[PDB]
Design an enzyme around this catalytic site. Structure first.
Site, mmCIF file in Angstrom:
data_model
loop_
_atom_site.group_PDB
_atom_site.id
_atom_site.type_symbol
_atom_site.label_atom_id
_atom_site.label_comp_id
_atom_site.label_asym_id
_atom_site.label_seq_id
_atom_site.Cartn_x
_atom_site.Cartn_y
_atom_site.Cartn_z
ATOM 1 C CG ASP A 299 -1.802 1.174 1.293
ATOM 2 O OD1 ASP A 299 -1.841 1.895 0.287
ATOM 3 O OD2 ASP A 299 -2.487 1.366 2.336
ATOM 4 C CB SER B 32 -2.190 14.427 -13.401
ATOM 5 O OG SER B 32 -2.594 14.182 -14.736
#
Ligand code: ZRY
Length: 330
Positions: free
Chosen positions: A35, A199
């Site tokens: 994770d 992004s």
């Protein structure tokens, strides 16, 4: 040194991925959820409330000659889905794919919430976010990657998750056969303890690319892709019959649909998520309404590049002095 381990979807929907981990002497192999959005290595154990164990493999520290109780240490964590777990702490030898760390903090669960009990395939979590998020008290502990980093040939790990197929986590090296083209690196902020990056925009299907900064986290422990409501609305508007369902808890769409792809930007590069990656199947057994794999981040409070996005790429978690993230197509 290096390590390399195969990671496998837990079910037919790729709801999560498990990777075998050796703990203790002699080894006890548990299948953990690696994770990058948390920083605790915790396991079901011989200390876990018996009624909260249902099919998981347990770590039994009393059978490990290298286990040592970490005196006074406890841990307690909760996750984005409202699940939680807590317990005490041992140090022990932990190996992943041939890479060994001695003295790793292994957090032994005394209690786990219902979602963990109900998932017999996940024996615990291995956190790979920054160690500043680790919950051990009163002395915070280091992740497996932080403990391994100085020994590794290069201070990196890579995530190559499969779509309905096995994939790989590598530690200490970049497998140049595992991706196409080049790896585009992008800046990371560690201020929230996450692999947090920006992004450069998105496209829906064959549509034009929209240049816009989207700050979010690379989180292998979140299943879906969580993005701003404007972006998610633009995606689902291209799917006939799709709607946001308050009763179900997100966007749903007719199971008969063929979904468009979703592209996200990494610098000037582009990662394309095929439409089939965005189908999470019937909302309930036998239903013809299917759950979408792109969902609004408005409720969770952060954008999350979860498995839906990450499995379309070869992803480098670069733990150099200034961390960065790399993405390649594959
Ligand atoms: N890294 C993790 N992200 C999780 N949920 N993320 C999420 C995002 C949005 C909505 C619901 C859940 C989660 C659950 C259990 C163990 C680890 C994790």
């Amino acid at each position: 040194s290096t390590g390399s381990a195969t990671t496998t979807p837990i079910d037919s929907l790729d709801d999560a991925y498990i990777t075998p981990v050796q703990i203790g002497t002699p080894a006890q192999t548990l299948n953990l959820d690696f994770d990058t959005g948390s920083s605790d290595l915790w396991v079901f154990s011989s200390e876990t409330t018996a009624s909260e164990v249902d099919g998981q493999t347990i770590y039994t520290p009393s059978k490990s000659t290298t286990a040592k109780l970490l005196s006074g240490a406890t841990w307690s964590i909760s996750y984005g889905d409202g699940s939680s777990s807590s317990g005490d702490v041992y140090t022990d030898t932990v190996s992943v794919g041939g890479l060994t760390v001695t003295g790793q903090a292994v957090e032994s669960a005394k209690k786990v919430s219902s979602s963990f009990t109900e998932d017999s395939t996940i024996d615990g979590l291995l956190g790979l976010a920054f160690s500043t998020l680790n919950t051990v008290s009163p002395t915070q502990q280091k992740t497996f990657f932080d403990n391994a980093k100085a020994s590794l040939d290069s201070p990196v790990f890579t995530a190559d998750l499969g779509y309905h197929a096995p994939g790989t986590y590598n530690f200490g090296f970049i497998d140049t056969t595992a991706y196409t083209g080049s790896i585009t690196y992008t800046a990371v902020s560690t201020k929230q303890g996450f692999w947090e990056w920006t992004s450069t925009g998105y496209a829906v299907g064959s549509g034009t690319f929209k240049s816009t900064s989207i700050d979010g986290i690379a989180d292998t422990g979140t299943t879906l892709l969580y993005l701003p409501a404007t972006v998610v609305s633009a995606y689902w508007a291209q799917v006939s019959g799709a709607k946001s369902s308050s009763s179900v808890g997100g966007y749903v769409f007719p199971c008969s649909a063929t979904l468009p792809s979703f592209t996200f930007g990494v610098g000037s590069a582009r990662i394309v998520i095929p439409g089939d990656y965005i189908d999470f199947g019937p909302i309930s057994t036998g239903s013809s309404s299917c759950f979408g794999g792109i969902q609004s981040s408005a409720g969770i409070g952060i954008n999350i590049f979860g498995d839906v996005a990450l499995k379309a790429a070869f992803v480098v978690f670069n733990g150099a002095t200034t961390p960065t993230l790399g993405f390649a197509s594959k």
